[PDB]
Each structure stands twice: as structure tokens, then as C-alpha cells.
Amino acid sequence: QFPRQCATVEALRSGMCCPDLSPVSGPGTDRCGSSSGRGRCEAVTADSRPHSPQYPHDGRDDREVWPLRFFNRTCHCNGNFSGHNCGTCRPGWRGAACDQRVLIVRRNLLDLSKEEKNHFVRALDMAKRTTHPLFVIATRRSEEILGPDGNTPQFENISIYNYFVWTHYYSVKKTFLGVGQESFGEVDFSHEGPAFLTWHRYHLLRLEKDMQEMLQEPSFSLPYWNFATGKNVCDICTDDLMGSRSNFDSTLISPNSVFSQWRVVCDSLEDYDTLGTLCNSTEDGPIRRNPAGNVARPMVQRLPEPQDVAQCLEVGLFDTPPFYSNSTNSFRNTVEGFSDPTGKYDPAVSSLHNLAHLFLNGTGGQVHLSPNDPIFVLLHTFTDAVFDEWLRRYNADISTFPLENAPIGHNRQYNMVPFWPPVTNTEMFVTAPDNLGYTYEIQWPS
Numbered sequence: 001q002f003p004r005q006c007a008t009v010e011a012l013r014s015g016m017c018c019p020d021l022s023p024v025s026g027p028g029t030d031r032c033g034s035s036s037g038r039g040r041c042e043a044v045t046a047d048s049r050p051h052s053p054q055y056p057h058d059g060r061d062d063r064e065v066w067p068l069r070f071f072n073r074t075c076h077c078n079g080n081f082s083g084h085n086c087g088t089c090r091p092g093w094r095g096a097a098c099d100q101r102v103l104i105v106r107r108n109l110l111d112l113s114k115e116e117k118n119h120f121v122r123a124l125d126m127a128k129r130t131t132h133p134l135f136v137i138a139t140r141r142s143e144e145i146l147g148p149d150g151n152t153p154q155f156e157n158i159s160i161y162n163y164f165v166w167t168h169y170y171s172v173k174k175t176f177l178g179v180g181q182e183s184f185g186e187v188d189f190s191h192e193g194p195a196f197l198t199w200h201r202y203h204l205l206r207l208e209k210d211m212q213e214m215l216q217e218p219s220f221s222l223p224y225w226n227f228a229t230g231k232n233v234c235d236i237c238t239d240d241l242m243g244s245r246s247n248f249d250s251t252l253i254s255p256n257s258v259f260s261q262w263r264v265v266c267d268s269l270e271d272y273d274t275l276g277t278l279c280n281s282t283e284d285g286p287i288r289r290n291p292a293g294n295v296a297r298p299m300v301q302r303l304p305e306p307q308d309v310a311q312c313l314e315v316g317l318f319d320t321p322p323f324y325s326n327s328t329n330s331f332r333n334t335v336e337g338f339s340d341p342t343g344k345y346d347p348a349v350s351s352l353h354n355l356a357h358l359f360l361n362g363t364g365g366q367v368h369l370s371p372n373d374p375i376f377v378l379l380h381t382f383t384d385a386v387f388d389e390w391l392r393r394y395n396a397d398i399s400t401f402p403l404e405n406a407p408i409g410h411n412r413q414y415n416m417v418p419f420w421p422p423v424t425n426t427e428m429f430v431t432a433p434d435n436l437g438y439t440y441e442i443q444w445p446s
């Protein structure tokens with residue numbers, strides 16, 4: 001979403017988000033660290049290429065041509081500075097000059113020490129309770145964003161973790177068209193298309209970046225969850241990590257885990273999609289989780305088996321036409337889990353990433369809420385581990401990532417919605433260690 005600095009009446013009608021870094025000649029003096037050699041407020045490049053015929057409503061919703069319905073110039077940082085005001089570094093660099101390289105390691109959560117496990121859990125929990133220093137979320141569309149008075153912007157403060165949740169909600173939210181008009185849903189800016197892996201890779205990056213600063217711990221790393229063991233049960237649903245089932249309500253988490261205290265954001269879509277609002281920062285319900293508890297749907301009562309991961313890494317084309325959730329022989333679609341581990345599609349298969357989400361039979365299984373269950377974070381580091389391995393074996397062959405006629409949101413150089421500063425899918429399409437400053441301690445089947 002947007003820097004608080006740009007969440008103003010001033011900045012919203014400038015069409016400009018170029019906040020100051022260190023201004024010692026007053027406001028306006030250091031927009032993008034430009035006094036130093038660091039960045040320069042210039043106009044945003046958006047992808048303009050056409051999307052799939054699937055999306056009818058070009059011109060009705062703020063996510064299109066991101067971020068151009070909000071901002072027309074952003075900071076473009078020079079070299080390896082990064083950030084909204086070019087104040088930090090691009091992934092894989094630190095130091096005052098962004099000249100010292102770094103490489104953190106994401107390990108399996110069950111290999112972590114006793115204290116490491118506790119500190120991760122306590123870190124997630126602190127991220128849930130701590131107000132994001134930088135981003136605030138819009139609670140209304142841009143049409144209503146400056147308030148009734150046309151002068152009180154309708155943005156709320158949001159916690160670090162809940163921001164993570166919000167950005168996911170806002171990329172899947174239905175397009176609202178008008179009251180009484182039933183909103184449009186064949187629309188997904190982060191799933192069922194090639195951007196699924198890059199959207200969720202940046203998603204993790206930003207949360208990791210955020211938790212790193214929160215903790216004052218530059219080398220904190222998001223551990224992963226190996227869910228491709230095929231077990232009957234959730235081997236990370238224990239009070240020492242993520243919480244086991246509550247003995248008083250088998251659909252809630254143990255009162256002996258902090259996550260039993262967590263309360264969700266964005267669990268009122270019938271409000272959002274009938275009045276044209278957005279998920280705001282107010283929490284309500286607790287997390288629901290019921291691993292393997294889906295009596296009605298036996299094909300989602302067991303996690304994927306180790307060779308499934310082995311096979312979906314045999315699919316050598318990243319994606320295939322129509323670049324949608326019914327793509328065949330498409331690596332993205334089969335890891336995302338609409339194809340079976342071989343590559344073949346069937347309206348009935350739910351494997352890998354998808355089945356992991358469905359297996360929890362609860363909050364983590366529901367698209368608009370699923371980051372509320374922090375298992376999400378580990379589910380996806382692992383999915384990002386499969387992705388990062390695929391790019392190692394196929395030397396990052398981006399040729400099959402389409403540049404046009406993907407579902408909207410999914411063209412190769414679309415800015416991933418609603419990440420800020422704008423970042424195109426292709427900048428996440430790289431081998432993470434040499435480029436994004438992280439790697440996975442992991443060993444693959446065969």
C-alpha cells in the first residue's frame with residue numbers, strides 16, 4: 001500500500017509519492033534522497049499491454065495499470081538503493097552505501113533450535129501487534145478515498161503482519177461496480193496465473209524485510225514448512241510452534257499458543273463487496289483451523305507426498321496458454337496446485353500449494369483470509385523454495401512468462417498489486433541467492 005507520507009490530500013492530487021529522506025533545507029528538499037546521489041522522483045512505468053479477455057471491466061477498479069489510479073511519479077532509486085524514499089537497500093545489500101552484500105538462509109522450521117523456534121513465534125506475534133512504521137491501508141476505493149469532506153483521507157494504521165494480510169486481500173478482492181450491482185469475481189491479481197509465484201515471492205520478501213527492521217535483526221530469515229511429507233496431520237501444529245488444536249473447540253488453536261489470541265482482519269466480504277469498501281484494520285473473529293478435518297472432501301485430508309515435489313520440478317515450461325488455472329504442462333499451475341504433480345489438469349485435482357491451504361480446513365484455506373493463519377508464511381516460503389529450485393535447474397528461463405494476454409495482474413511487467421514501490425513480476429524472476437540475498441537450506445527428493 002502507500003507510505004503514510006503520501007496518504008495525504010496534498011500527495012493524492014499531485015499524483016506524486018516521492019517523500020523526503022533527510023531534508024535539512026525544509027520539506028521538499030530531499031525527495032528520494034536526491035540531495036545525496038540516491039534517488040530521483042520520476043514518472044512511473046506501468047504495464048500497458050493487454051490482458052486476457054477474462055476481465056471485462058477496464059476502467060472500473062483501482063488495481064488496473066497499477067499504480068496509475070493513485071500515483072504518477074514515484075521515487076526511482078539509483079544503483080542499489082531501494083525503498084519509498086530510497087532510504088534502504090535492494091534485496092541482498094546493506095551498509096550506508098548499499099555496497100556490502102548479504103545472504104541469509106531460510107531453513108526448515110523443524111531443524112531450528114529450541115530458542116530459534118521460540119524467537120520466531122515471538123517475532124510473528126510481535127509483528128501482529130506492532131504498528132507498521134511505514135505503510136497505511138486505504139479503507140475505501142479512490143472515488144471515496146478523500147472522505148466525505150474531500151479532505152480527510154480514509155487510511156488507517158495497520159500492524160506489520162496485518163499489512164501482509166491486507167495486501168493479499170486487496171489482490172483478490174472482487175471488483176466493485178455499484179450498489180445493487182453484484183461485484184465481479186473472475187479476477188485475481190496474485191493467483192491462477194503466472195504472477196502467483198512472483199507476487200507471493202515479493203510478499204514474503206516484504207514481510208521478511210519488515211520483521212528484520214522490527215527486530216533490529218538484519219539477518220532474521222523466514223523459515224519454511226515442508227508440507228510435502230504426505231502425513232495425516234500437521235507436523236507444525238504444536239504449542240512450541242504455530243499451536244496445536246484446542247481441547248475446548250477442535251476448530252480453534254490451543255489456548256497455550258499465542259496464535260490462539262490472534263484475531264483476523266478482512267473477514268467481512270459481504271460488507272466490502274456490497275458497499276464498495278475495503279478491508280480495514282479492525283480485527284474480529286479468531287483463527288479457525290482443522291487439519292485433515294474436512295470430512296466432506298477426502299482428497300484434502302492428506303498433504304502432498306514427497307515425490308509430488310520431485311515431479312512438478314520435472315515440468316520444464318514455467319507456464320502455458322491460457323496462462324490460467326486450467327493450464328496444462330505448466331510448472332506454475334502445477335506447483336500452485338490446479339494440475340496434478342505431472343502437469344495434467346482435471347477440475348478435481350488439488351495438489352501441492354493448493355492442497356496445503358485446503359488441508360488446514362479453516363482460515364488458512366480461504367483465499368481472502370488465508371494469511372491470518374501464520375502457517376501461511378511457512379506454507380509459502382516452502383512454495384517459494386520450490387520456485388527458487390525450478391529457476392536454478394532451468395537457468396531462470398523467463399521466456400514462457402507471457403508479456404500480454406495473461407489474466408489482468410499477470411502480464412510479465414505488471415506492477416504487482418498493491419506493492420510499493422512498484423515492482424514488476426520480472427524482478428522477482430531471478431535465482432534468489434545471487435540476486436535477492438536469501439537461499440534455502442533444503443534437500444530435494446529423487
Ligand SMILES: *[C@@H]1O[C@H](CO)[C@@H](O[C@@H]2O[C@H](CO)[C@@H](O[C@H]3O[C@H](CO[C@H]4O[C@H](CO)[C@@H](O)[C@H](O)[C@@H]4O)[C@@H](O)[C@H](O[C@H]4O[C@H](CO)[C@@H](O)[C@H](O)[C@@H]4O)[C@@H]3O)[C@H](O)[C@H]2NC(C)=O)[C@H](O)[C@H]1NC(C)=O
Nearest residue numbers: 052053054055056186321322323324325326327328345407
Ligand atoms: C479455461 O477457463 C476459461 C474460463 O474459465 C475457459 O474459457 C471459456 O470457454 C467458454 C466456451 O469455450 C467461453 O464461454 C462463452 O464463450 C462464447 C463467447 O462469449 C464471449 O463473447 C460474447 C459475445 O461475443 C459475450 O457475451 C461474452 O462477454 C464473452 O466474452 C459464448 O458465446 C458462449 O456462449 C455459448 O454457451 C452458452 C452455454 O455455455 C450457451 O447457452 C449460449 O447460447 C452460447 O451459445 C460461452 O458463453 C468463455 O468465454 C471462455 N473463457 C473466457 C475467459 O471468456 C477455457 O475454455 C478453459 N480452458 C480449457 C477448457 O481448455
Ligand SMILES: *[C@@H]1O[C@H](CO[C@@H]2O[C@@H](C)[C@@H](O)[C@@H](O)[C@@H]2O)[C@@H](O[C@@H]2O[C@H](CO)[C@@H](O)[C@H](O)[C@H]2NC(C)=O)[C@H](O)[C@H]1NC(C)=O
Nearest residue numbers: 011012013014015016043067068069070071072073142143
Ligand atoms: C499526473 O498526475 C496528476 C494528478 O492527478 C491525480 O492522479 C491520479 C491519483 C488520479 O486519480 C487523478 O484523478 C488525480 O487527480 C495529473 O493532473 C491532473 O489531471 C486531471 C485530468 O486528468 C486534471 O483535471 C487536473 O486538474 C490535474 N491536476 C494537476 C495538479 O495536474 C496529471 O495529468 C498526471 N499525468 C499523466 C497521467 O500523464
Ligand SMILES: *[C@@H]1O[C@H](CO)[C@@H](O[C@@H]2O[C@H](CO)[C@@H](O)[C@H](O)[C@H]2NC(C)=O)[C@H](O)[C@H]1NC(C)=O
Nearest residue numbers: 139267268269271272277278279280281282284
Ligand atoms: C471496518 O470493517 C468492518 C467490517 O466491514 C466494519 O464493521 C461493520 O460495519 C457494518 C456497517 O458499517 C455493520 O453492519 C457490521 O455489523 C460491522 N461489522 C463488524 C464486525 O464491525 C467497520 O465499519 C469498518 N470500519 C470503518 C471505519 O469503516
Ligand SMILES: *[C@@H]1O[C@H](CO)[C@@H](O[C@@H]2O[C@H](CO)[C@@H](O)[C@H](O)[C@H]2NC(C)=O)[C@H](O)[C@H]1NC(C)=O
Nearest residue numbers: 290293294295296297358360361362363365366
Ligand atoms: C471444512 O470442512 C468442512 C467439512 O469437513 C466444511 O463444512 C462442510 O461444507 C460442505 C460444503 O460447503 C457441506 O456440504 C457440509 O455439510 C459441511 N459439513 C460440515 C461437517 O461442516 C467446511 O466448509 C470446510 N471449511 C473450510 C474453510 O475449508
Ligand SMILES: *[C@@H]1O[C@H](CO)[C@@H](O)[C@H](O)[C@H]1NC(C)=O
Nearest residue numbers: 004007131133136155156157
Ligand atoms: C498512524 O499513527 C501515527 C503514529 O505512528 C499517528 O501519528 C498518525 O496520526 C496515524 N496516521 C494515519 C494515517 O492513520
Ligand SMILES: O=c1cc(CO)occ1O
Nearest residue numbers: 354357364365366367370
Ligand atoms: O491461494 C490460496 C488457495 C486456496 C485454495 O485453493 O486457499 C487460500 C489461498 O490463499
Ligand SMILES: [Zn+2]
Nearest residue numbers: 168190191370
Ligand atoms: Zn495466496
